[PDB]
Design a binder for this molecule. Structure first.
Ligand SMILES: Cc1cc2nc3c(=O)[nH]c(=O)nc-3n(C[C@H](O)[C@H](O)[C@H](O)COP(=O)(O)OP(=O)(O)OC[C@H]3O[C@@H](n4cnc5c(N)ncnc54)[C@H](O)[C@@H]3O)c2cc1C
Ligand SMILES: [Br-]
Ligand SMILES: [Br-]
Length: 455
């Protein structure tokens, strides 16, 4: 309808990428490569006007909007099948203040670009763990990493946003402005508009003592029991996480471990590094550490470490869910399907959150399950588009085989066929509450390609 297309390009200094321009089959590809979808319009917005135009445009056309910052939607929400892609990867500017300990970042940032500007001043705020993950879809779901047990979720450090809502208007959501919207972006997602800016508190993070070993699966059941036990009685500065996987062919690992399911235990001490080598070594030798690696490295080097760059996988499938305990038998059943790992890319991720996250009132952010400390995540990953079921089944037949021991679920780990879990994840009180926020701000559900909340 060239009536709309007419004055869009009038107010659009960015770039449009049609299904004919050469760079289309590469701009419609996202990080989860099981997603062969074909949009009809790519907008690489470059400023807030570029977003308001596209959102006004995409309204005045009725196009299924897929918004996109980093592309790491483990459900494929960042590319639509025939709509418009409001792409923000070039909204990537950052302002950092050494003395205000304030940061300010556009919505298309990657974590690495954010951790590189703040660490120029020996600063940081908690965010994800892999650097090319986008800052948008992560922060709009809560977002956790190594700083989270000490400094909380990313939403706990967010002071204000700038958001472009469905009607084509630009707001400012803080605690003194649209606190309803601010309550809902912090854990809701795109549902309520496109966020063109964030503002974070920062924290002085210097070097950290980091260690990562690869215990053997046979000694597994006690380590998981050591890990489960010790993190319930652990200080906020101890961040420990277990990843079950095939041992990479790395020269610090014996060849008689290469390819066989091991336990990768990655730990860091967010404080004085000498209390690091004390508090770390008290937990390092619960099993027999193999492939050992310790270092006193800066935070920005810790965020770029994960994971061990064997490769970046093309095809992934994840099944997540929160936990409250870890029954002795589930511990036996995660070790049951660790010896069934098919590819060296799938990980069975056991993370103990809690810390400064759990010390936050539930009804303070739209993020659910703060009082849940354990987060499990059967993340499959593979290369062969014809081995799709063997890996996808290992997640299903492992998610299910303990789905009674699970509560809720992280929205940012959801798979494509999983919109049915938005109530189960958020809970009836957060959902019912997020309903009337969408009703006010997204009264038409203009932003529907997410873990959606209908008004
Ligand atoms: C390798 C890997 C590691 C991860 N590590 C962590 C971790 O440590 N902690 C954690 O909490 N999560 C983690 N995640 C999950 C991650 O937060 C989600 O995948 C998130 O959706 C990625 O955001 P993105 O913007 O990069 O992806 P996208 O595909 O661009 O976005 C996905 C969703 O976010 C929305 N969105 C993105 N940007 C904006 C914006 N500016 N305005 C409005 N809506 C927006 C989209 O509309 C869509 O619904 C990880 C994921 C991967 C793949
Ligand atoms: Br679609
Ligand atoms: Br990755």
């Amino acid at each position: 309808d060239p009536a709309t297309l007419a004055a869009f390009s009038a107010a659009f200094r960015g770039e449009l990428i049609w299904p004919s321009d050469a760079d289309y089959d590469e701009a419609r590809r996202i990080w989860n490569g099981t997603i062969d979808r074909r949009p009809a319009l790519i907008a690489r917005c470059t400023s807030t006007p570029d977003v308001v135009a596209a959102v006004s445009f995409a309204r005045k056309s009725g196009l299924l909007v897929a918004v996109r910052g980093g592309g790491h939607s483990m459900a494929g929400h960042s590319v639509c099948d025939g709509g418009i892609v409001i792409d923000l990867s070039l909204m990537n500017s950052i302002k950092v203040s050494r003395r205000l300990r304030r940061a300010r970042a556009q919505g298309g940032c990657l974590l690495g670009a954010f951790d590189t500007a703040t660490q120029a001043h020996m600063l940081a705020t908690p965010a994800g763990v892999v650097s090319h993950t986008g800052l948008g879809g992560l922060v709009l779901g809560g977002g956790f990493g190594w700083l989270s047990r000490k400094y909380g979720l990313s939403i706990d450090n967010l002071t204000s946003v700038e958001i472009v809502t469905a009607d084509g208007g630009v707001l400012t959501a803080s605690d003194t402005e649209n606190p309803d919207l601010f309550w809902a972006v912090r854990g809701g997602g795109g549902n309520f508009g496109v966020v063109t800016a964030f503002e974070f508190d920062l924290h002085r993070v210097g070097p950290v003592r980091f260690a990562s070993t690869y215990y053997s699966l046979d000694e597994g059941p006690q380590v998981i029991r050591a890990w489960r036990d010790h993190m319930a009685t652990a200080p906020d500065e101890l961040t420990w996480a277990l990843y079950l996987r095939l041992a990479p062919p790395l020269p610090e690992l014996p060849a008689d471990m290469h390819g066989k399911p091991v336990i990768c235990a990655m730990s860091c001490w967010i404080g004085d590094p000498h209390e690091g080598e004390r508090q770390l070594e008290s937990i390092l030798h619960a099993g027999k550490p193999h492939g050992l690696t310790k270092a006193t490295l800066p935070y920005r080097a810790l965020q770029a470490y994960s994971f061990p760059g064997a490769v970046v996988p093309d095809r992934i499938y994840t099944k997540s869910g929160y936990l409250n305990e870890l029954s002795d038998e589930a511990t036996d059943t995660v070790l049951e399907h660790a010896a069934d790992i098919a590819s060296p890319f799938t990980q069975l991720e056991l993370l103990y959150l809690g810390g400064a996250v759990a010390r936050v009132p539930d009804d303070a952010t739209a993020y659910p399950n703060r009082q849940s400390p354990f987060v499990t995540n059967l993340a499959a990953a593979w290369m062969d588009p014809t081995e799709d079921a063997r890996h996808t089944a290992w997640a299903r037949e492992g998610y299910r085989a303990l789905a009674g021991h699970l509560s809720g679920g992280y929205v940012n780990f959801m798979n494509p066929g999983e919109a049915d879990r938005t109530r189960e994840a958020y809970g009836a009180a957060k959902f019912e509450r997020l309903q009337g926020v969408k009703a006010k701000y997204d009264p038409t559900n203009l932003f529907r390609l997410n873990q959606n909340i209908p008004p």
